[PDB]
Amino acid sequence: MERYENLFAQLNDRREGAFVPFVTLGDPGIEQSLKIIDTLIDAGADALELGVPFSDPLADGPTIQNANLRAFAAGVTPAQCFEMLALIREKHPTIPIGLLMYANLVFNNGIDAFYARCEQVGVDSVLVADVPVEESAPFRQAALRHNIAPIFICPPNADDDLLRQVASYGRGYTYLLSRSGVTGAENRGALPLHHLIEKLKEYHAAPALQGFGISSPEQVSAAVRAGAAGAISGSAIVKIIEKNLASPKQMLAELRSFVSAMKAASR
Amino acid sequence: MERYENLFAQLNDRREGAFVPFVTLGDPGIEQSLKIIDTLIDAGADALELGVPFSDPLADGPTIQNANLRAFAAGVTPAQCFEMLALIREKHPTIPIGLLMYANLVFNNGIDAFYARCEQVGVDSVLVADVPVEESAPFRQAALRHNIAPIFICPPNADDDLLRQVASYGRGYTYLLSRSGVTGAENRGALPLHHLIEKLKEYHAAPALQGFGISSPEQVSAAVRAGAAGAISGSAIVKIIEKNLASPKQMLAELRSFVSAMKAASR
Amino acid sequence: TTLLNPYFGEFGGMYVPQILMPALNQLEEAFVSAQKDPEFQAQFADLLKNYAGRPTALTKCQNITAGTRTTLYLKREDLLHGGAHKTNQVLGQALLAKRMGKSEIIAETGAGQHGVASALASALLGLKCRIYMGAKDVERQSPNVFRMRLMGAEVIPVHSGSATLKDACNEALRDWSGSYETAHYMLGTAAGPHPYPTIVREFQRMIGEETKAQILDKEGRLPDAVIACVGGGSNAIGMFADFINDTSVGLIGVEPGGHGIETGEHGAPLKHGRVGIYFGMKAPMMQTADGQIEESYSISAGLDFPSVGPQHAYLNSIGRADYVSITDDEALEAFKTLCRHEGIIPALESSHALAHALKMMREQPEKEQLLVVNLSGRGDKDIFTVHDILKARG
Amino acid sequence: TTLLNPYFGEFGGMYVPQILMPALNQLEEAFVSAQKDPEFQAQFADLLKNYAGRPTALTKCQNITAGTRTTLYLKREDLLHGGAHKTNQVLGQALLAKRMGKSEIIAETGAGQHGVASALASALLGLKCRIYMGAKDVERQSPNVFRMRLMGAEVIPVHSGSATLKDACNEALRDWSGSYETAHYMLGTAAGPHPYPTIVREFQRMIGEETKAQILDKEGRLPDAVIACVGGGSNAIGMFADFINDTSVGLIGVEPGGHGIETGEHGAPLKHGRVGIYFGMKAPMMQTADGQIEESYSISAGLDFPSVGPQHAYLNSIGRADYVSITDDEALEAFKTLCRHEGIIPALESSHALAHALKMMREQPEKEQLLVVNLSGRGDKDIFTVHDILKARG
Ligand SMILES: O=P(O)(O)OC[C@@H](O)[C@@H](O)Nc1ccccc1O
Ligand SMILES: O=P(O)(O)OC[C@@H](O)[C@@H](O)Nc1ccccc1O
Ligand SMILES: *Cc1c(COP(=O)(O)O)cnc(C)c1O
Ligand SMILES: *Cc1c(COP(=O)(O)O)cnc(C)c1O
Ligand code: NA
Ligand code: NA
Q: Burial of D317 by CB count in 10 Å (0-12 exposed, 13-18 middle, 19+ buried)?
A: middle
DSSP B156: T
Given an 8 Å threshold on Cβ–Cβ distance, is B104 in contact with D21?
Answer: no
One DSSP character per residue, A235-254 reads HHHHHHHHHTTT-HHHHHHH
Find the catalytic residue in A46, A60, A124, A254: A60
Q: Give yes or no for a contact between A63 and A242, defined as CB atoms under 8 angstroms apart.
A: yes
Compute the CA torsion angle C21, C23, C28, C32 (nearest 10 deg). Answer: 150
Answer whether D151 sits within 8 Å of C123, measured CB to CB: no
**Strand ranges for C125-267 from DSSP E:** 128-134, 154-158, 183-185, 225-229, 250-258
| Contact between D131 and D108 (Cβ < 8 Å) | yes
Exposed / middle / buried, residue D36 (Cβ in 10 Å: 0-12, 13-18, 19+) = exposed
State phi, psi for D313 to the nearest 5 degrees.
-60, -35
Which residues pair with residue D274 across a beta bridge?
A: D285
Determine the 3-state secondary structure of C173 from DSSP: helix
Quick one: which of C342, C387, C385, C310 has its CA closest to C59?
A: C342
Give the strand pairing for D58-60 and D70-76: antiparallel
Q: Is A168 left (phi over 0), alpha (psi -120 to 50) or beta?
A: alpha
Domain end (from C183, C204, C225): C204
Q: How far apart are CA D124 and CA D113, in angstroms?
A: 17
**Run of H or E including A21:** strand A18-24
**Taking Cα atoms as reference points, which of B54, B49, B167 lies closest to residue B103?**
B54
Dihedral of the alpha carbons of B27, B33, B37, B42, in degrees to the nearest 10:
-130
By the 8 A CB rule, do C96 and C31 touch?
Answer: yes
> Which amino acid would we find at residue B83?
E
Chain C residue nearest residue D381, CA to CA: C380
Can you give the residue range of the structural domain that contains D33?
A: 8-52+86-204
Q: Is the preceding peptide bond at B28 cis, omega within 30 degrees of 0?
A: yes
Helix axes D196-204, D310-317, angle to 10 degrees: 80
The reply to whether C198 and C242 lie within a common domain is no
- A176 has which bridge partners? A154, A210
Rounded CA-CA distance B214/B18 in Å is 13
- Pair (D194, D210) in one structural domain: no
Residues C324 and C192 in one domain: no
Examine the domain organization and report whether D94 and D20 are in the same domain.
Answer: yes
- Round to whole Å and give the CA distance between A259 and A253: 10
Indicate whether C332 belongs to any domain: yes
Encode burial over D337-349: b for 16+ CB neighbours within 10 A, e otherwise: bbbbbbbbbbbbb
Record the resolution, in angstroms: 1.5
Residue type for position D162: S
Residue A214 contacts residue A196 (beta carbons within 8 Å): no
- Rounded CA separation A120/D266 (Å): 82
Q: What is the 3-state secondary structure (H, E, C) of C54-95?
A: CCCCEEECHHHHCCCCEEEEEEEHHHCCCCECHHHHHHHHHH
Separation CA D27–CA D176 (nearest Å): 13
Nearest residue to C82 (alpha-carbon basis) of C56, C100, C110 = C56
Task: Report the C-alpha gap between B37 and B49 in whole angstroms.
Answer: 10
Question: Buried b / exposed e across B228-257, counting CB within 10 Å, b at 16+?
Answer: bbbbbbbbbbbbbbbebeeebeebbebbbe
Q: How many CA atoms lie within 13 A of A231 on its CB side?
A: 30
CB of D51 within 8 Å of a chain C CB? The answer is yes
Compute the distance between CA of residue D252 and CA of residue D230 in angstroms, rounded to an integer: 10
Spatial contact of C350 and C333, defined as CB atoms under 8 Å apart: no
**Closest to B11 in 3D by CA, of B45, B39, B48:** B45
- CA angle, residues D74, D79, D82, in degrees to nearest 5: 135
- Asked if D6 and D13 touch (Cβ cutoff 8 Å), the reply is yes
Residues sharing a CB contact under 8 Å with residue C177, sequence separation 6 or more, in sequence order: A59, A180, A181, A182, C17, C19, C20
What CA–CA distance (Å, rounded) separates A82 from A25?
10
Do residues C248 and C375 share a domain? yes
Q: What are the Cα distances from residue C170, in Å, to B118, C158, C174, C291?
A: 83, 9, 6, 16
Per-residue burial over C339-353, b = 16 or more CB atoms within 10 Å of its CB, e = otherwise = bbbbbbbbbbbbbbb
Q: Residue A232 in contact with residue A209, Cβ under 8 Å?
A: yes
Check if the beta carbon of residue B240 is closer than 8 Å to that of residue B251. Answer: yes
Q: How many domains does chain A have?
A: 1
CA D53 to CA D51: how far, in whole Å? Answer: 6
Please report how the helices A137-145 and A111-121 are oriented relative to each other, as an axis angle in degrees rounded to 10. Answer: 40
List, in order, residues 6 or more apart from A5 with CB less than 8 Å away. Answer: none
- For chain B, list residues whose CB is within 8 angstroms of any CB belonging to chain D: 54-62, 65, 69, 77-79, 103-105, 107-109, 129-135, 152-155, 157, 162, 177, 179-182
Q: Does residue C175 lie within any of the structural domains?
A: yes
Measured CA to CA, the distance from residue C76 to residue C60 in angstroms comes to 10
Spell out where chain C has E strands.
7-8, 11-15, 58-60, 70-76, 104-109, 128-134, 154-158, 183-185, 225-229, 250-258, 274-278, 280-285, 322-327, 369-375
Residue A9 backbone dihedrals phi, psi, to 5 degrees: -70, -40
Question: What CATH number should be reported for the domain holding residue D250?
Answer: 3.40.50.1100
Closest ligand (CA of C85): 3
Q: Does residue B234 line the site of ligand 2, with CB under 6 A?
A: yes
Tell whether C225 is within 8 A of chain D (Cβ). Answer: no
With residue B177 as reference, give the H or E element that holds it.
strand B174-177
Separation between Cα atoms, residue B52 and residue B99, nearest integer Å: 7
Neighbours of chain D (3+ CB pairs under 8 A): B, C
C278 by DSSP, 3-state: which? strand
Q: Pairing mode, if any, of strands A149-151 and A153-154?
A: unpaired
On whether both C240 and C339 belong to a single domain, the answer is yes
- Cα(C119)–Cα(C43) distance, integer angstroms: 19
Rounded Cα–Cα distance for residues A204 and A163 (Å) = 10
State how far residue D247 is from chain B, nearest Cα, in angstroms.
33
Q: Tell whether C1 is covered by a domain.
A: no
What does the alpha-carbon distance between residue A46 and residue A40 come to, in Å, rounded to a whole number? 9
CA of D278 to nearest chain B CA: how many angstroms apart? 6
* Amino acid code (one letter) for B160: D
Phi, psi for D60 (deg, rounded to 5): -85, 135
Chain C residues in contact with D86 by the CB 8 A cut-off are none
List Cβ neighbours of D166 (8 Å cut-off, separation of 6 or more): B56, D134, D278, D279, D293, D295, D306
To the nearest whole angstrom, how far is the Cα of C133 from the nearest Cα of chain D?
A: 20
CA C62 remoteness from chain centre: 27
Close Cβ partners of B161 (under 8 Å, ≥ 6 residues apart): none
Q: Which of D111, D120, D125 is nearest to D165 (CA)?
A: D111
User: Which residue, among D219, D198, D241, D273, has the nearest Cα to D374 in the 3D structure?
Assistant: D241
For residues C94 and C105, what is the distance between their CA atoms, to the nearest angstrom? 8
Q: Is D3 within a domain? A: no
Angstrom distance (rounded) from CA C275 to CA C312: 13
Instruction: Return the residue of C nearest to D117 by Cα.
Output: C343
User: Are B158 and B169 contacting, i.e. CB atoms less than 8 angstroms apart?
Assistant: no
Say how many Å lie between the CA of residue B215 and the centre of ligand 2.
11
Nearest by CB to C342, from D123, D343, D344: name it: D123
Catalytic residue list contains D341? no
> Distance, CA D375 to ligand 6 centroid (Å)?
18
> What CATH number does residue A108 fall under?
3.20.20.70
- Contact in structure between D297 and D308 (CB atoms under 8 Å): no
Q: Distance from the CA of C376 to the center of ligand 3, in angstroms?
A: 7
* Strands D154-158 and D183-185, bridge-based pairing: unpaired
Q: Report whether residue B24 contacts ligand 2, using a CB cutoff of 6 Å.
A: no
Three-state SS for C157? Answer: strand
| Contact between B132 and D277 using a beta-carbon 8 Å cutoff | no
Residue C168: name the closest of C128, C114, C123, C90 by CA.
C114
> How far is it, in rounded angstroms, from Cα A20 to Cα C252?
53
CA A13 to chain centre: 23
D315 and D353 fall within a common domain: yes
HSE (side-chain half, CA atoms, 13 Å) at C353: 31
Phi then psi for residue C297, to 5 deg, are -100, 135
Report whether C376 contacts C349 (CB < 8 A).
Answer: yes
According to DSSP, residue D180 is labeled T
Contact between B156 and B180 under an 8 Å Cβ cutoff? The reply is yes
* The dihedral sign for the CA sequence D377, D381, D384, D389: negative
Asked if residue C95 lies in contact with residue C44, where contact means CB atoms within 8 angstroms, the answer is yes
DSSP D49: I
Examine residue C210 and state whether it is found in any structural domain, yes or no: yes
Which chains form contacts with chain B, at 3 or more CB pairs under 8 Å?
D
CB atoms within 10 A of CB A250: 12
Q: Which residues on adjacent β-strands are paired with residue B128?
A: B101
Q: What CA–CA distance (Å, rounded) separates C94 from C203?
A: 11
Find residue B6's DSSP bridge partners: none
If you take atom 9 of ligand 2, which residue's CA is the nearest one? B234
CB-nearest partner of B78 from D287, D290, D293: D290
Active-site residues of C, by number, are 61, 85
Q: Are D298 and D36 in contact (CB under 8 A)?
A: no
CA distance C172 to C166: 10
Tell me whether the omega of the peptide bond preceding residue D17 falls within 30 degrees of 0, making it cis.
no
End-to-end Cα, chain C, rounded Å: 60
Find the helix or strand (DSSP H, E) in which B150 lies.
Answer: strand B149-151
Same domain, C97 and C79: no
- C310 preceded by cis ω (within 30°)? no
Dihedrals phi, psi of D165, to nearest 5 degrees: -55, -50
Question: In this structure, are C40 and C74 located in the same domain?
Answer: no
Q: State how far the Cα of D93 lies from the Cα of D91, in Å rounded to an integer.
A: 6
Are residues C166 and C94 part of one domain?
Answer: yes
Distance CA C113, CA C118 (A): 9
Q: Which helix (H) or strand (E) holds B18?
A: strand B18-24
Residue A206 CA neighbour count, 13 Å, CB half: 26
How far, in whole angstroms, is CA A46 from its chain's centroid?
11
**DSSP letters spanning C302-345:** GG--SB--HHHHHHHHTTSSEEEEEEHHHHHHHHHHHHHHHS--
Same domain, C265 and C119: no
Q: Where are the alpha helices (DSSP H) in D343-382?
A: 348-363
Backbone angles phi, psi at C16, to 5 degrees: -125, 160
Burial D148-159 (b: 16+ CB within 10 A, else e): bbbbbbebbbbe
Nearest to D343 by CA among D87, D62, D53: D62
Q: Considering C148, C173, C204, which residue would you say is the last residue of a domain?
A: C204
Distance CA D67, CA A12 (A): 67
Domain stops at, among D148, D180, D204: D204
Q: How far apart are CA C189 and CA C310, in angstroms?
A: 11
Contact of D53 with chain B, judged by CB distance below 8 Å, is answered with no
Tell me whether residue D380 is in a domain. yes
Cα-Cα-Cα-Cα torsion A255, A259, A262, A266, nearest 10 degrees, comes to: 180
B19: left (phi over 0), alpha (psi -120 to 50) or beta: beta
- Count of the separate structural domains present in chain D: 2
Give the orientation angle of helix C113-125 with respect to helix D328-342, to 10 degrees: 90
As a residue count, chain B comes to 267
C381 and C268, same domain (yes or no): yes
The DSSP code sequence of D21-46 is HHHHHHHHHHHHHHHT-HHHHHHHHH
CA distance C141 to C158: 14
Burial D250-284 (b: 16+ CB within 10 A, else e): bbbbbbbbbbeeeeebbbbbbbbbebbbbbbbbbb
B170 three-state secondary structure: coil
Chain breaks in chain A following residues, C–N > 2.5 Å = none
Q: How many CA atoms lie within 13 A of A43 on its CB side?
A: 23
DSSP element (H, E) containing C137? helix C135-140
Dihedral angle, C-alpha D61, D64, D67, D69, nearest 10 °:
-50
Say how many Å lie between the CA of residue D217 and the centre of ligand 5: 44
User: Is D261 inside any structural domain?
Assistant: yes
Flag whether C2 is in a domain: no
Please give the helix or strand (H or E) that residue D154 lies within, else none: strand D154-158
Residue of B60, B117, B135, B191 to mutate when probing chain D, most D C-beta within 10 A: B135
Burial class of residue C5 (count of CB atoms within 10 Å of its CB; 0-12, 13-18, 19+): exposed
- Domain membership of residue A95 as a residue range: 1-267
Sign of the C-alpha dihedral computed for residues D54, D203, D304 and D64 taken in this order: negative
CA distance C342 to D125: 8
Question: CA–CA separation, C306 vs C258, rounded Å?
Answer: 13
Host H or E run for residue D12: strand D11-15
* Distance of CA D189 from the midpoint of ligand 6 (Å): 10
